[PDB]
Amino acid sequence: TALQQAFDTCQNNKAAWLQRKNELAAAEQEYLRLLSGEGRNVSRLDELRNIIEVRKWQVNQAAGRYIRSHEAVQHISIRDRLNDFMQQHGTALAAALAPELMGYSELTAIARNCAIQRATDALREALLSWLAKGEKINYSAQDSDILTTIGFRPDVASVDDSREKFTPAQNMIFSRKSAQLASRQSV
């Protein structure tokens, strides 16, 4: 399913994000070791300084991509579970909304928009009243394992990491440097 793929991608993206944070930390650590020593490796320091800049960008990109993949999983589940819900109870729901919705398949564009907006306001009010009961809400059983596994929201750390904005021109430079970093043989 699309949901399963979306979950595999989210899990992959979260790992990539944490991997980048590890790599950055490893570079920061080597840099600091050199700053703390007696030597003065001008070129190694300069190269590490460049690497650190690249890793920060990678952390930022990975964090954003992870957040979007996380939201994608939830978005797909909601859509799909709501479709199943309407399959079971659409008739009763529409019937309750009949004074707004009856004759929908015959309405003009302008009429359909009004009808949907008003039906939507009524639904919102009903949802709000039900929510006020304070009943605890669990995930749909069908998607509970996946939704539980991914967590309710991405950690704020990923939001902090992706806050910085990079232009397309910057992404061009950094994506080039990333590829260069990826083909480096350590020696």
72 sits near Hg ion (criterion: CB under 5 A): no
What does 64-102 look like in DSSP terms, one character per residue?
HHHHHHHHHHHHHHHHHHHHHHHHHHHHHHHHHTHHHHT
Considering beta carbons, is residue 11 or 140 the nearer one to Hg ion?
11
Per-residue binding letters, 91-120, with a copy of itself (x by CB under 8 A): xxxxxxxxxxxxxxx----------x--xx
Q: How many whole angstroms separate alpha carbon 2 and alpha carbon 150?
A: 16
145 sits near a copy of itself (criterion: CB under 8 A): no
Least distance to a copy of itself, CB of residue 14, Å: 16
78 residue type, one letter: I
Considering beta carbons, is residue 41 or 83 the nearer one to a copy of itself?
83
- Cα distances from 60 to residues 1, 141, 162, 171, 186, in angstroms, run 29, 34, 4, 11, 24
Q: Which of residues 128-187 bind Hg ion (CB under 5 A)?
A: 150
First-to-last alpha carbon distance for the chain, in angstroms, is 44
Question: Which option in a copy of itself, Hg ion, none does residue 81 bind, with CB closer than 5 to 8 A by kind?
Answer: a copy of itself
Scanning 42-50, 59-67, 78-86, 173-181 for contacts with a copy of itself by CB under 8 A, the matching segment is 78-86
In this chain, which of 30, 139, 155, 175 binds a copy of itself, going by CB under 8 A?
Answer: 139
User: Which of the 8 DSSP states describes residue 135?
Assistant: P
Least distance to a copy of itself, CB of residue 17, Å: 20
Helix (H, G, I), strand (E, B) or coil at 7: helix
